Design a protein around this ligand. Structure first.
Ligand SMILES: CNC(=O)c1cc(Cl)cc(C)c1NC(=O)c1cc(Br)nn1-c1ncccc1Cl
Ligand SMILES: [Zn+2]
Lengths: 447, 281, 146, 49
């Protein structure tokens, strides 16, 4: 099967080549069939009630959709295994970087042991194919170089999963594809893509499409992809759960204040709560307070003009000047004030988030990205902003400097080129300036 | 440690350096005559490779106005007469690809052979304003003659910068170490105007980078970036991951933990360029 | 001037000449200039207003066909939840309009046929399209004015 | 930028601005790097020499 074994990764290559534009057409054709969906009608006549399609002098409008929907589900399949083809290394690399970080520096699983991720990360050390997808694969032995002096070796070797450790340390010093594969590491990293946020949302995008062939109208929830797709309209839906932690409890206050306020009408003001204009057919809703409370949160937070507009005019003297206190102490509380809190905790938070959306633009526009010198003192030198932004304190040239020190040998590197690396590997970073670059006290000999 | 530069400056190193540099600029005046003269001349220029890293190392711990830095440049006025040659030698073969880059100098002899005659190019190069009069026929003699009727600038082009891709960048580094290190000096300023060509050619391949060190004494270090990883960092596979982490160094990051995230950002990006260069065409 | 020679065809198209006050003074120029100052996001969030109720009306077109009727005549019944192109024009005619929900054009739910689901339907229309997403369109004008 | 190319070749271009020797100091500027016969026809100097 060697003629096909590289042919399918060649298929996956031009599958992942135009991933962005394929996802764009996957959005727009679903948008187009959800637009052509606007011309559906239902009636009692057969083509009980049968959902038919309304068309004017065109015949292939209905057999187009039965292939366009399978087209949308197929391109949904395409983008799903394209996601799992290109960028599962992004959800792979950083957390075993984090894991090796706490193995070498802190000792998170040997010196102590702690949540949701910390004990699921214990099904990854003992397999021999753990570091196969990260650059440093001697990570299981420098932890023994680190803390082989304080604890027992025979316990930590079995805990880290070194099979015949003392034999391999002398052997490496001196001198059926799925059957050799592991059973635990693949299901361990199969758990994390379901745990993380993006892949389960992209699978939610496809769990509706095969369901969409059962009934055509559940394709409408695919138009909420506009809300999370762009970042501009992502902050509106993100602002609710940004301050939901107090908003659910103050709408609970809204739920309990009217539950306090309706028992006095259920007990003392049973007379007038009636909307049935028929005299022979009277059905008041202040007979059961479970009905009365659903009625009260159906109209009182709703109408915006009190509660006694569903109820006719108090022309009688039976507690006349008490209901005019009742209605306005409903009015001054539940529509005037406690609705304006729910307005404010959305609109203010909108203002706070959109202002900090561009104060980071202010921070890129004025600050330095390296150190703590602002741009106000670069004003004496004419156009001294870009000569410091593009070349010297640049974001790309430093990662290029981190790039070019990896490939060639360290029998080539100099005093400063080893100075920048020998504490980079043990990861201590007071090597950046953080207070002086070309301007503060280098001005005395600068012409 | 700058204690070696106490004796290496005061003793007998630099007249030996000018005695090397004279023959270094004079050997390739005659070792460009024939096609069988290049596999040993490139041996001499990856000796030039380490001749430049000889005095690259005396710029370590470089005081801005220091007598070591002035004795770096009195070199080139004790030996003023052998530097113009090695500065224009890297210009007479690097505007070489800029002759072909214009369409006016391409449509001279439209023969499908590719054998343009030498005399049709001599009077053509005499018409440009970026050339020197007596300096035409000598590089014509450096080119292959073949009875004075064959240039073949496709092999005039790609053969003479294969040893001048690595030495040209480091001599550009040599001219740009000292321009910003010692200011306000007359005679070290003219030769960068005479040799700004390799600096202009290596503008994308040059970078100016600062590291704090040696008990609060910061001085700049230069590096090289390859053309393979040059043109591919400017793609939207990573230029939006740029702003993806630009948004979250002030939104959640502190002052003490800002670049501790940035080094993992750089290694994760060079990791996706590892796998993307694997699956690249 | 392209309106003035046209103004002799019918006399009443001289009324558009009173919008010269809006751009003539600089004080009342900023009011009409504030709309296109932040229209670049306002047209897309009113597109959000257009698509959220288009999401929200198919569940009434499919599952709540019973009560959407304003015709008080029993012999002449014309409900508007028969074609969803009519239903969507109806919904953006009254729902962003009335400011008190959607079930005030519709009579009272006295029946037990999905009673406690329409009281969730109406208030999840109410909490979204009049309470919040109209106050965004208010704020993106008044703040920008400020 | 390309509608501004129907203004250089006419001889009555600088007639409404103070400096009307603008078509010749551009040749003083960049008459050394390019061809003169092309830029004279492009700037519209009828019988320049
Ligand atoms: C956040 N939703 C997604 O990830 C997403 C996931 C899947 Cl399975 C399918 C689509 C169409 C998605 N939607 C987009 O992918 C998308 C929506 C919008 Br609006 N823009 N946009 C986009 N963003 C950047 C590059 C190319 C595109 Cl098409
Ligand atoms: Zn700085």
């Amino acid at each position: 099967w060697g003629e096909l074994e590289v042919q399918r990764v060649k298929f996956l290559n031009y599958l992942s080549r135009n991933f962005y534009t394929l996802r764009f057409l996957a959005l727009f054709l679903a948008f187009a069939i959800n637009f052509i969906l606007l011309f559906y009608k239902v009636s009692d006549s057969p083509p009980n009630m049968v959902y038919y399609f309304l068309e004017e002098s065109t015949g292939y409008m209905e057999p187009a959709l039965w292939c366009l929907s399978l087209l949308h589900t197929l391109v949904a399949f395409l983008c799903i295994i394209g996601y799992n083809c290109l960028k599962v290394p992004l959800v792979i690399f950083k957390r075993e970087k984090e894991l090796a970080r706490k193995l070498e520096f802190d000792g998170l699983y040997i010196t102590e042991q702690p949540d949701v991720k910390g004990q699921w990360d214990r099904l990854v050390l003992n397999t021999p194919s753990f570091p196969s997808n990260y650059w440093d694969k001697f990570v299981k032995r420098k932890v023994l170089d680190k803390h082989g002096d304080i604890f027992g070796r025979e316990r930590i070797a079995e805990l880290l999963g070194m099979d015949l450790a003392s034999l391999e340390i002398t052997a490496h010093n001196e001198r059926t594809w799925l059957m050799s594969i592991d059973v635990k590491y693949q299901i361990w990293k199969f758990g994390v893509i379901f745990t993380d946020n993006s892949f389960l949302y992209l699978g939610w995008y496809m769990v509706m499409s095969l369901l969409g062939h059962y009934n055509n109208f559940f394709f409408a929830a695919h138009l909420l992809d506009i809300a999370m797709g762009v970042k501009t309209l992502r902050t509106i839906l993100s602002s609710v759960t940004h301050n939901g932690k107090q908003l659910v409890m103050t709408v609970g206050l809204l739920a309990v204040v009217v539950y306090l306020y309706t028992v006095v009408a259920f007990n003392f003001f049973r007379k007038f709560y009636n909307k049935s204009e028929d005299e022979d057919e009277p059905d008041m809703k202040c007979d059961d307070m479970m009905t009365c409370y659903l009625f009260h949160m159906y109209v009182g937070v709703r109408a915006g003009g009190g509660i006694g507009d569903e109820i006719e005019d108090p022309a009688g003297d039976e507690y006349e000047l008490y209901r005019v206190v009742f209605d306005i102490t409903f009015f001054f509380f539940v529509i005037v004030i406690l609705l304006a809190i729910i307005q404010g905790l959305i609109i203010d938070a909108f203002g706070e988030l959109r202002d900090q959306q561009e104060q980071v633009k202010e921070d890129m526009e004025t600050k330095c990205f390296i150190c703590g010198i602002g741009s106000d003192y670069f004003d004496t030198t004419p156009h001294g902003f870009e000569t410091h932004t593009l070349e010297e304190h640049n974001l790309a040239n430093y990662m290029f400097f981190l790039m070019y020190l990896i490939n060639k040998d360290e029998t080539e590197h100099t005093g400063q080129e080893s100075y920048v690396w020998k504490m980079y590997q043990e990861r201590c970073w007071d090597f950046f300036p953080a207070g002086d670059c070309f301007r503060k006290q280098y001005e005395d000999q600068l012409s | 440690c700058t204690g070696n530069q106490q004796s290496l400056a005061h003793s007998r190193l630099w007249d030996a350096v000018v005695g090397f540099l004279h023959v270094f600029a004079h050997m390739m005046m005659k070792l460009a005559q024939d096609s069988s003269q290049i596999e040993l001349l490139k041996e001499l220029l990856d000796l030039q490779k380490d001749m430049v890293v000889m005095l690259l190392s005396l710029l370590e711990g470089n005081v801005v106005n220091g007598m070591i830095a002035r004795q770096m440049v009195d070199m080139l006025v004790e030996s003023s007469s052998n530097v113009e040659m090695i500065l224009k030698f890297f210009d007479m073969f690097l505007k070489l690809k800029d002759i072909v880059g214009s369409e006016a100098f391409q449509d001279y002899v439209t023969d499908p052979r590719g054998l343009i005659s030498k005399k049709d190019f001599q009077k053509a190069m005499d018409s440009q304003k970026q050339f020197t009069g007596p300096e035409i026929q000598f590089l014509l003699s450096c080119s292959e003659a073949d009875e004075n009727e064959m240039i073949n600038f496709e092999e005039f082009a790609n053969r003479f910068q294969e040893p001048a891709r690595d030495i040209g960048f480091n001599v550009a580094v040599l001219l740009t170490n000292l321009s910003e290190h010692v200011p306000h000096d007359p005679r070290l300023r003219n030769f960068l105007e005479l040799a700004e060509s390799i600096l202009e050619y290596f503008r994308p391949y040059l970078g100016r980078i600062e590291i704090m060190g040696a008990s609060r004494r910061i001085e700049r270090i230069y590096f090289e970036i390859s053309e393979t990883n040059r043109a591919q960092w400017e793609m939207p596979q990573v230029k939006e991951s740029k702003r993806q982490f630009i948004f979250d160094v002030v939104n959640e990051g502190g002052e003490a933990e800002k670049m501790e995230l940035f080094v993992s950002f750089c290694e994760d990006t060079i990791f996706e360029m590892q796998i993307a260069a694997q699956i690249s065409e």
